[PDB]
């Protein structure tokens, strides 16, 4: 039941995505003009309205997908504009599809997919979670941000062995402790016009954290752009490793805090094209002869649905594409065969 304010900012909304003939958005492409008005005016339990998924998307039109999810619900009562754009970004994932129950699967299966450390500079798996009960980034109020990061922090300062580590919120925190963590590449600050436009900085830095292990293998950023971005990392490629720890970290830490989850959609973030799994991994790797030959890598990179990034040579950041329709082991079981023929292929050239 949107009142009438937001349902008058909304028709401004699709006046404007109407008017921008040329705008290339998920938004624009999917919210058509009986979506539109089927959804226009609908409100979630928590206040949640169709401007707080597209507002986005309205005010920088030159947005890829556009859409953002404001609270668990929101996925749900305007499923008729989430499904199709969950689909064209991850194809295959149909509208009648259903993504699998969470299975993190054998975790001894991973192994060091290059043990004499020739190839991988670092492996990373990280995976995103929103805490059940609370609204997401554009609907959370100041006063949840802070019991949220009370209840994180005293969760991820009571991990033990291997996790053991330190917690920074970002209120408060000094140049000293920022430089600190900039040298590590474990800080992050306020998003760009994208994210601010979502009302995802809202109140900023309350209720924003940091938070590593004595070893820096492991990092959890708080309310950046979830509840809860969760990464496991270390050099060289023993991605086994990587994920078991990540696995250990996710379990310990669901013990003290549920995560919002969907049965069609899996665990449910902020982003709609991270959802599913929301698993990334990755790695820095090395293929300078791969390098001299791109299609080759291009031709195996697609068929385990790998993204491959330049970030000094033929270094490579490698990750997968896929979240949905596939359980976490089926993601890093493919990530996993992807690195591993890469590399069989780079040492026969
Ligand atoms: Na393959």
Redesign the pocket.
Known sequence: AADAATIAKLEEGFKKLEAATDCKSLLKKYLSKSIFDSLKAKKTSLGATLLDVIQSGVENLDSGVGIYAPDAEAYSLFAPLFDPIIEDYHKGFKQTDKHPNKDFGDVNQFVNVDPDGKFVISTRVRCGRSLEGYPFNPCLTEAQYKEMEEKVSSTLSGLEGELKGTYYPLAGMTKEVQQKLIDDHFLFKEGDRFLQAANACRYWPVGRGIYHNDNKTFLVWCDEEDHLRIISMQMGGDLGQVYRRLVSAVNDIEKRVPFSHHDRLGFLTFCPTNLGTTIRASVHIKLPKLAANREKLEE?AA??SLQVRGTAGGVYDISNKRRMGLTEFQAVKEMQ??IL?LIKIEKEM
């Open positions: 195996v068929r385990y065969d992807g023929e």
